Amino acid sequence: MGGGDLDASDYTGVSFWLVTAALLASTVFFFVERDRVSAKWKTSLTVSGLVTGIAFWHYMYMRGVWIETGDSPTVFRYIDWLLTVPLLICEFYLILAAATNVAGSLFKKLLVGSLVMLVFGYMGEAGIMAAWPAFIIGCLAWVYMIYELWAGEGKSACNTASPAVQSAYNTMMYIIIFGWAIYPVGYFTGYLMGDGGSALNLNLIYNLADFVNKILFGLIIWNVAVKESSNAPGG
Ligand SMILES: *C/C=C(C)/C=C/C=C(C)/C=C/C1=C(C)CCCC1(C)C
């Protein structure tokens, strides 16, 4: 709960264990809860869960291996991310907008997403410089993302849409912003300062961001979909 000072095997182990435990817990819960989800969301959870599940597992493995030695094939994480971004988004918006027809959000996410990956890939290729400025490029892209998103055609479909769709959308944007905004928040804590520049904090923070950007994604989407659809309190 705060600090930032652990040996290699120390931090590596703590995170590794936390990831394994969390991953499993989220897997068993999300799996068993697969039957405790809204009916109309049957396909929503199928496409969203399939893409989110494959990306999470893949990315997770890649990340772990990357920090394991220090060098790994980014081509996998790049293509996976670029293949999961438009997939998870398009699908999610597909079934979500399916209530009326289709969601144009795919276009917005396509442009923004492409740009983000472009910078991360181009700069990441050398990793010489981009962590510091990452706050700028990211901030701008983030603001613009929600800026136009806030006016999405979602509610434009009919007028005020349904309470379920509005709940899932609002919660989705909220998490996306928080998480995406947290990435740079923690990274900076280990980018310039930390303890001389330990790769540990880098891997951990990275895995944490991708973990919540994948796990939490389905956790919230499902929680809001199940809570809105028809469910009672109890945790
Ligand atoms: C499954 C993995 C996910 C959803 C990855 C999300 C990644 C980002 C939101 C990347 C953000 C970045 C910044 C906000 C600043 C510039 C550098 C980035 C692209 C690495």
Domains of the chain: 1-235 (1.20.1070.10)
What SS3 class is residue 232? coil
Rounded CA separation 106/87 (Å): 9
Q: Please enumerate in sequence order all residues whose Cβ is within 8 A of that of 126, keeping only pairs 6 or more positions apart, or say none.
A: none
**Ligand 1 atom at minimum distance from 59 CA:** 1
Identify whether the C-beta of residue 90 lies closer than 8 Å to the C-beta of residue 107: no
Rounded CA separation 7/163 (Å): 49
Identify whether the C-beta of residue 5 lies closer than 8 Å to the C-beta of residue 195: yes
Copy the structure tokens of residue 73: 């094939």
| Interior/surface letters 212-234, b for 16+ CB within 10 angstroms, e for the rest | bbbbbbbbbbbbbbbbbbeeeee
Sign of the CA dihedral running 166, 176, 86, 67 = negative
Exposed, middle or buried, 168 (CB in 10 Å: 0-12/13-18/19+)? buried
Exposed, middle or buried, 119 (CB in 10 Å: 0-12/13-18/19+)? middle
Query: Angle at CA 192, nearest 5°, toward 73 and 212?
Result: 55
Identify whether the C-beta of residue 99 lies closer than 8 Å to the C-beta of residue 162: yes
Rounded CA separation 211/65 (Å): 15
Rounded CA separation 28/122 (Å): 37
CA of 92 to the centre of ligand 1 (A): 19
> What residues does ligand 1 touch, defined as CB less than 6 Å away?
55, 59, 81, 116, 119-120, 134, 137-138, 180, 183-184, 210, 213-214
CA of 210 to the centre of ligand 1 (A): 8
